Design an enzyme around this catalytic site. Structure first.
Site, PDB file in Angstrom:
ATOM      1  N   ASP A  60       0.820  -1.211   0.000  1.00 32.52           N
ATOM      2  CA  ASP A  60       0.000   0.000   0.000  1.00 32.52           C
ATOM      3  C   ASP A  60       0.862   1.271   0.000  1.00 32.52           C
ATOM      4  O   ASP A  60       1.403   1.660   1.048  1.00 32.52           O
ATOM      5  CB  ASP A  60      -0.901  -0.011   1.232  1.00 32.52           C
ATOM      6  CG  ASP A  60      -1.936   1.096   1.269  1.00 32.52           C
ATOM      7  OD1 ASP A  60      -2.210   1.665   0.160  1.00 32.52           O
ATOM      8  OD2 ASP A  60      -2.490   1.372   2.347  1.00 32.52           O
TER       9      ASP A  60
ATOM     10  N   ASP B  52      -1.816   5.350  -5.723  1.00 34.45           N
ATOM     11  CA  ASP B  52      -2.111   4.451  -4.607  1.00 34.45           C
ATOM     12  C   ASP B  52      -2.278   2.996  -5.018  1.00 34.45           C
ATOM     13  O   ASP B  52      -3.337   2.565  -5.479  1.00 34.45           O
ATOM     14  CB  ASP B  52      -3.375   4.899  -3.880  1.00 34.45           C
ATOM     15  CG  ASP B  52      -3.525   4.142  -2.595  1.00 34.45           C
ATOM     16  OD1 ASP B  52      -2.706   3.309  -2.233  1.00 34.45           O
ATOM     17  OD2 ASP B  52      -4.590   4.444  -1.890  1.00 34.45           O
TER      18      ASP B  52
END
Lengths: 6, 327
Positions: free
Chosen positions: B31, B210
């Site tokens: 992440d 992201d």
């Protein structure tokens, strides 16, 4: 689905 | 350079990492949109089904584990969240290991697995800040620069790659184009414009780059007209949320232009996700910063440089050829 931090 | 395969799960890409003296195996979300590493405790309470299919951690069986005693809580953009307690242990990732790394041992969560947050210290859910995994990789001499390259690879590939401290120059076309960050906290760059199959739209706002988000979220100022043009429609996902759906049976591409001439092209198939949801959603309606997620990132080679505070972009080149250099 998902959406990862504020 | 340390490097890891990334395993496509559907909503996320997992990275494998082992924790503790007994090397307890985890698969956690890679992440770039968060900064804390956390694992699912073997005794955790999962809020939503089985959050223990991608590993668990039992602190009691690692002789090198130490609890730090401080509590951990975090909330994510999709409204999932986690609670636990900070600790430290030896972590194995990328073909190497780091000692005395701080991470959270999570005892209740609505996320489906643990998360390896590799973002900036400014998005850590901690005060004071601390050395997260990318910082420690550098500090312990595993990499010279706190930076990493992301290659999610093609739709259908089984595995993508992250390289810590290095860049695979065989895996993009043109030149990497360096972008400064435009957020005080996120790995976010300016999006200049979006041409979605010929419908072009000014942007001029930051987007978080992201890996931990499945699809992409942009303001209504862009998304409204595109929903009309493509036949995307809101339906309850319920209760009281809604998302844009699209006919599963809905050629061309969407080009995203950033500063300094960088342009990434994404085939329109990336915008139909199995009922099918649209691969664009509204950042306004969903209450998140604008985000370019995995459906975008599969088509980019991205170098995140946390020392320089830059994100560099180029159109991906899907190839087994490899020429890795240190960043």
């Amino acid at each position: 689905x998902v959406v990862x931090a504020x | 350079s340390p490097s890891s395969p990334l395993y496509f799960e559907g909503p996320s890409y997992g990275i494998r990492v082992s924790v503790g003296s007994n090397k307890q195996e985890q698969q956690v979300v890679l992440d770039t949109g968060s900064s804390d590493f956390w694992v699912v405790d073997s005794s955790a309470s999962c809020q939503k089904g089985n959050c223990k299919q991608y590993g668990t951690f039992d602190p009691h069986s690692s002789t090198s584990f130490k609890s730090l005693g401080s509590s951990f809580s975090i909330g994510y953009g999709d409204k999932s969240s986690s609670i636990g307690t900070w600790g430290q242990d030896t972590i194995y990732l990328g073909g190497t290991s780091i000692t005395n790394q701080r991470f959270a041992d999570v005892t209740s969560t609505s996320v489906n697995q643990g998360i390896l947050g590799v973002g900036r210290v400014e998005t850590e859910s901690a005060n004071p800040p601390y050395d997260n995994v990318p910082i420690t990789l550098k500090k312990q001499g595993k990499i010279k620069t706190n930076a990493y390259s992301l290659y999610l690879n093609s739709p259908g590939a089984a595995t993508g790659t992250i390289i810590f401290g290095g860049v695979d120059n065989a895996k993009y076309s043109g030149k990497l184009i360096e972008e400064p960050l435009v957020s005080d906290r996120y790995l976010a760059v300016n999006l200049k414009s979006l041409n979605y199959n010929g419908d072009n739209s000014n942007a001029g706002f930051g987007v978080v780059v992201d890996s931990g988000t499945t699809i992409s979220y942009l303001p209504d100022s862009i998304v409204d007209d595109l929903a009309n043009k493509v036949g995307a429609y809101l339906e309850p996902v319920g209760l009281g949320n809604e998302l844009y759906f699209i006919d599963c049976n809905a050629q061309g591409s969407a080009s995203f232009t950033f500063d300094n001439g960088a342009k990434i092209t994404v085939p329109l198939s990336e915008f139909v996700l199995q009922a099918c949801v649209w691969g664009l959603q509204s950042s306004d309606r969903q209450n998140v910063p604008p985000i370019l997620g995995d459906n975008f990132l599969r088509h980019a080679y991205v170098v995140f440089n946390l020392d320089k505070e830059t994100v560099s972009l180029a159109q991906v080149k899907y190839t087994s050829a490899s020429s890795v250099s240190a960043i």
